[PDB]
Design a protein around this ligand. Structure first.
Ligand SMILES: CCc1oncc1-c1cc(F)cc(C(=O)NC[C@@H](N)C(=O)O)c1
Ligand SMILES: N[C@@H](CCC(=O)O)C(=O)O
Lengths: 275, 281
């Protein structure tokens, strides 16, 4: 019985309250498949993590169900306690987020829009990509930015605020990059706890540019006409299922993902949740 | 460091792997090229043949050069002669895949598509070039993608669409498994190679060519007058990538994966993409 960790991130993972009887609202596009996911009710920094049953659905949840049926495993899903994707921080060295939970055995598998990168691959097994995407920039329909090489990002100030999500593999990449220095550290001053908070902050003109996953941002702009992406995809990369290096499921997870790309299932998910 | 001189197989497919004749006076490969050998038969009444010294370059050859330096191996590079990328024939793998399966090569480097059936018999690195299946047409041709009914049920239209692939690779395998009627219909329009397929399109003998997305995008970008185009929003069915195929359980996979991901993270991959894959169109 596998412990699955995921994270709130539309349209990959929706998170809603249960009904009063503890089940999930019946919804339809075909029934929307939903799972009970436990998660903290307190989101705040440094707070006690009181877990409660919630309802989870979306692209990643459909993928999970496909995996579990294909490979014949049972599961329980929970939202990552600290609310984060996962970065490695000096304490000597520790992973936070979903990465931390998988490495500690709190999770057996990460099923989330988790970017495959070198730093994480040193410690965990990633599947072949279930989605290919990259980074883009979300702004208010109004703002005009060429892209990631605009002067206002390259040589920034307190005039034009931009940011990403904390303890994501975007965030630590900017803090770490030499040519990024003035933006690297600038985003440190404005980074958000979650993508949802960043997106709303763009709508309320508190954040002028949000650097984030194209799969999430393009979806947000398709729904909210006051938001637009700008510039080309950059840092093109994949999302992968995350498992411990000695997981016995690792081969079959990748085969299943490859099978699903090739037979149109991943395209079906893209038409259900993204298109 | 131990047993780090590796047999490596590749396959010509511009711009990922480009093969040139060596300078015969020097028998040295120069500049951005690396030595690669090709076994060439004396005749067809014989197994007798000789290794010809050639020179190899391209996107995938630069990947190999970086891997060699980063992972600390040397290699003897050779061009496959038993088929092409890889196909299972009477339950026996040919091509680059076959060379890895039957342990003649430690790894295969080239325009080699990651799929499920190959993953059963070889280990693949992480994908280092994004690909899948695209469709090339002359500009203005209206087709939605692989899934268009003009492909799926061609004989519903008069006249029917004329479309083909190059057989025996990942694209044909995918179509054979997913769209049986399409597949059997298409065989009439099978192309010997990409170059033939492009000529057929440009002269009006084929209405579409279904093939690997990375190669099609490259060819679209280099096309005279920008007539040949890929359909949709840079659109790709069955998104996958090229991967370095290694023998099952290979001790080289760990370090090769990390290296490839480092190249992505460091901007080295983007440099290579700009060097080899950018087009005018
Ligand atoms: C190999 C690509 C890479 O190497 N270094 C950074 C990146 C990168 C590329 C990208 F498109 C998204 C993210 C990311 O962090 N997105 C938030 C979230 N999906 C996450 O996983 O944290 C990171
Ligand atoms: N890259 C393909 C060859 C071309 C194709 O069939 O699309 C392969 O590895 O088989």
């Amino acid at each position: 019985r596998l412990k699955i960790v995921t994270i709130h991130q539309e349209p990959f993972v929706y998170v809603k309250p249960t009904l009063s009887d503890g089940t999930c609202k019946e919804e339809f596009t075909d029934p929307v498949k939903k799972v009970i996911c436990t998660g903290p009710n307190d989101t705040s920094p440094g707070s006690p993590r009181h877990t409660v049953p919630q309802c989870c659905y979306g692209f990643c949840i459909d993928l999970l169900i496909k995996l579990a049926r294909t490979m014949n495993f049972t599961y329980e899903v929970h939202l990552v306690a600290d609310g984060k994707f996962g970065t490695q921080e000096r304490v000597k060295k520790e992973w936070n987020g979903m990465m931390g939970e998988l490495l500690s055995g709190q999770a057996d598998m990460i099923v989330a829009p988790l970017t495959i990168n070198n730093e994480r691959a040193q410690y965990i097994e990633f599947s072949k990509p279930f989605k290919y995407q990259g980074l883009t920039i979300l702004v208010k329909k109004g703002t005009r930015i060429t892209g990631i090489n605009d002067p206002r990002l390259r040589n920034p100030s307190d005039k034009f605020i931009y940011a990403t999500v904390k303890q994501s593999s975007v965030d630590i990449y900017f803090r770490r990059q030499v040519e990024l220095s003035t933006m690297y550290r600038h985003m440190e001053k404005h980074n958000y706890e979650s993508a949802a908070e960043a997106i709303q902050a763009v709508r309320d003109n508190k954040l002028h540019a949000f650097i984030w996953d194209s799969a999430v941002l393009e979806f947000e702009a398709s729904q909210k006409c006051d938001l637009v992406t700008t510039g080309e995809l950059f840092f093109r990369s994949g999302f992968g299922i995350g498992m411990r290096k000695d997981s016995p499921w690792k081969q079959n997870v990748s085969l299943s993902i490859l099978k699903s790309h090739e037979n149109g299932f991943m395209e079906d998910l893209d038409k259900t949740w993204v298109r | 460091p131990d047993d780090n001189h590796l047999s490596i197989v590749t396959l010509e497919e511009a711009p990922f792997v480009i093969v040139e004749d060596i300078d015969p006076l020097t028998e040295t490969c120069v500049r951005n090229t690396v030595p690669c050998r090709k076994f060439v038969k004396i005749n067809n009444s014989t197994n007798e043949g000789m290794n010809v010294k050639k020179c190899c370059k391209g996107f995938c050859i630069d990947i190999l050069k970086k891997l060699s330096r980063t992972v600390k191996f040397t290699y003897d590079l050779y061009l496959v002669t038993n088929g092409k990328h890889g196909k299972k024939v009477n339950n026996v793998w040919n091509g680059m895949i076959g060379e890895v399966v039957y342990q003649r090569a430690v790894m295969a480097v080239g325009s080699l598509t990651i799929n499920e059936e190959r993953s059963e018999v070889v280990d693949f690195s992480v994908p280092f070039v994004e690909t899948g299946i695209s469709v090339m047409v002359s500009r203005g041709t209206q087709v939605t993608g692989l899934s268009d009914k003009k492909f799926q049920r061609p004989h519903d239209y008069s006249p029917p669409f004329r479309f083909g692939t190059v057989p025996n690779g990942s694209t044909e395998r995918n179509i054979r498994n997913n769209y049986p009627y399409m597949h059997q219909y298409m065989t009439r329009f099978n192309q010997r190679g990409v170059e033939d397929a492009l000529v057929s399109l440009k002269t009006g003998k084929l209405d579409a060519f279904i093939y690997d997305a990375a190669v099609l995008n490259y060819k679209a970008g280099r096309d005279e007058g920008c007539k040949l185009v890929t359909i949709g929003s840079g659109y790709i069915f069955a998104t996958t990538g090229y991967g370095i195929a290694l023998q099952k359980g290979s001790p080289w996979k760990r370090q090769i994966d990390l290296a490839l991901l480092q190249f992505v993270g460091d901007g080295e991959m983007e440099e290579l993409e700009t060097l080899w894959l950018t087009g005018i169109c």
